[PDB]
């Protein structure tokens, strides 16, 4: 739906070399407002967006406290887990966590989610009815049972349906300029002869927000998921994204190829053709 607040935790064990690395990140839609890194000077929750800097010192102190609380939970979790799966003390292992809420175009609660992985694998996810867990294996049933006793989901339902939305709403208001804007992709096309009898047509989308886009090639109006090269979307740095999609054509036959571009910033999709 129209708006989403997510939080991303990674903890990485380093056995020979001290306490696990912990990195927390918060996101409103495709925008990063806060960051904690255990290997960084300040040892504080730091801003990364203009519309969060205005928040008072009660905000930062809180977050710093709670985020250190989170890293301390994760530090235990790497112990318990290594044990559950009986892994040696020798190896690095990764815990990843992701929670937050989506709201819809009226900014009422759409949906909650709270997902946990170990070593890049689904371990335990809270189900969309926000009452029950999905356990990926029988290490993870142990945990589920543990969290069923400790009535965990009940206390997550409180935050996801309440505080999560109510501060999502807040971050949208205080960042109206940035968070509610849509940047249409600026489109052009380039040519590069490749082979004596071949060119490449690279169709470009630049400076778009949010990050959801679709670029397709047609030959004579018939779609070509064939013969094409599509780079995964990527941040400009400046809070906008870029994408390109290339097909390689038989030279003299460029005019036949059209690249088509969808984004919510476009009412009617744009068709672009090679045109010196």
């Amino acid at each position: 739906g129209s708006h989403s607040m997510r939080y991303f935790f990674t903890s990485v064990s380093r056995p020979g070399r001290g306490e696990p690395r912990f990195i927390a990140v918060g996101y409103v839609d495709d925008t990063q407002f806060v960051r904690f890194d255990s290997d960084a000077a300040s040892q504080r929750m730091e801003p990364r967006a203009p519309w969060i800097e205005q928040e008072g010192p009660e905000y930062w102190d809180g977050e710093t406290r709670k985020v250190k609380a989170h890293s301390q939970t994760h530090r235990v979790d790497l112990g318990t887990l290594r044990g559950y799966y009986n892994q040696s003390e020798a190896g690095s292992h990764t815990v990843q966590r992701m929670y937050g809420c989506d709201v819809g175009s009226d900014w009422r609660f759409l949906r909650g989610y709270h997902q946990y992985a170990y070593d890049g694998k689904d371990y335990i996810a809270l189900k969309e009815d926000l009452r029950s867990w999905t356990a990926a294996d029988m290490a993870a049933q142990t945990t589920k049972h543990k969290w069923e006793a400790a009535h965990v989901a009940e206390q997550l339902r409180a935050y996801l349906e309440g505080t999560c939305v109510e501060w999502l709403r807040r971050y949208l208001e205080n960042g109206k300029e940035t968070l509610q804007r849509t940047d249409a992709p600026k489109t052009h096309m380039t040519h590069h002869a490749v082979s004596d009898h071949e060119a490449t047509l690279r169709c470009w989308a630049l400076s778009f927000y949010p990050a959801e886009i679709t670029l397709t090639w047609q030959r004579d109006g018939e779609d070509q998921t064939q013969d094409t090269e599509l780079v995964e979307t990527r941040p400009a740095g400046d809070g906008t994204f870029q994408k390109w999609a290339a097909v390689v054509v038989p030279s003299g036959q460029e005019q036949r190829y059209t690249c088509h571009v969808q984004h919510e910033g476009l009412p009617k999709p744009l068709t672009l053709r090679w045109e010196p």
Partner: peptide, 9 residues
């Protein structure tokens, strides 16, 4: 805003 609940597996 972050949770107040530390979820040890």
């Amino acid at each position: 805003l972050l949770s107040x609940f530390g979820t040890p597996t």
